[PDB]
């Protein structure tokens, strides 16, 4: 029965784990918002081959995923879960946590995202040949940007994105439910102190994160059927294990 002190300590613990694994400093992301790819540079990206652009994006996503893996390893309660469940939670949740974290790198004012040193629009990614998915991802980042999460709120929310007791294949669901509930108390407690409980009703609906993840897997399938050798030769093995069917 998590006491008030234990809940307060859980808040601090979650925020600490996030701060140590957040990948890019927010201050750096925000100061870079003025650095936007030129028309010429956008053209260059649009002229890249499908394979090269996927390969680059696959590498960048894997880098982000590695930070989320570390976040999980440092998240209190997570390493205490059975190994099977650790894997189930990360395989389903890693991409979902990156998608949420990404809103930090998204500028709602001009609909650009930080990518390879500058900010660019969704048309930057045209060579991928998955523009509906990219458009849906930008839309998602835009919806989250309207909540204006603090770093601590991202920490606590992404903890719950990961520690999701409804994932299929959990062998010890009760232990996940219990950690999930304690994380919810931590989240609610922090929001109550900051008068931000209103955001709970405005969080991404049921199935949204699942849809973006499923589409990513589907679009990878389409690419991999068209370019099988590239995926085998050049894609990060972790990316293949998480997403290749």
């Amino acid at each position: 029965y998590a006491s008030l002190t234990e809940i307060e300590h859980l808040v601090q613990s979650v925020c600490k784990s996030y701060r140590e694994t957040c990948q890019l400093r927010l201050e750096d992301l925000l100061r870079q918002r003025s650095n936007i790819f030129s028309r010429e540079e956008v053209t260059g990206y649009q002229r890249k081959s499908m394979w090269e652009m996927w390969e680059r994006c696959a590498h960048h996503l894997t880098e982000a995923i590695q930070y989320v893996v570390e976040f999980a390893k440092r998240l209190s309660g997570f390493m205490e879960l059975c190994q099977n469940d650790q894997i189930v939670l990360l395989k389903a949740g890693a991409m979902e946590v990156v998608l949420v974290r990404m809103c930090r790198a998204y500028n709602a004012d001009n609909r650009t995202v930080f990518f390879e040193g500058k900010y660019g629009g969704m048309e930057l990614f045209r060579a991928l040949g998955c523009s509906e998915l990219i458009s849906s991802i930008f839309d998602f980042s835009h919806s989250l940007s309207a909540l204006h999460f603090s770093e601590d709120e991202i920490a606590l929310y992404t903890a719950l994105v990961l520690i999701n007791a409804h994932r299929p294949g959990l062998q010890e669901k009760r232990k996940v439910e219990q950690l999930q509930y304690n994380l919810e108390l931590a989240f609610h407690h922090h929001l109550c102190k900051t008068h931000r409980q209103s955001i709970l009703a405005k969080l991404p609906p049921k199935g949204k994160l699942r849809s973006l993840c499923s589409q990513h897997v589907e679009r990878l399938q389409i690419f991999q059927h068209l370019h099988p050798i590239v995926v085998q030769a050049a894609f990060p093995p972790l990316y293949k294990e998480l997403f290749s069917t």
Binding site: I87, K91, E241
Partner: peptide, 10 residues
Amino acid sequence: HKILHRLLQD
């Protein structure tokens, strides 16, 4: 899940 397993060690 060879890779994820390895990442979770230590």
